[PDB]
Amino acid sequence: EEADDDMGFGLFD
Structure with missing residues (x-):
């Protein structure tokens, strides 16, 4: 991908 x-970071990490 x-x-x-x-x-x-805190989202898609």
Whole structure:
């Protein structure tokens, strides 16, 4: 899955 756009926390982590 593509999600390497600066993101990762309490939401989809």
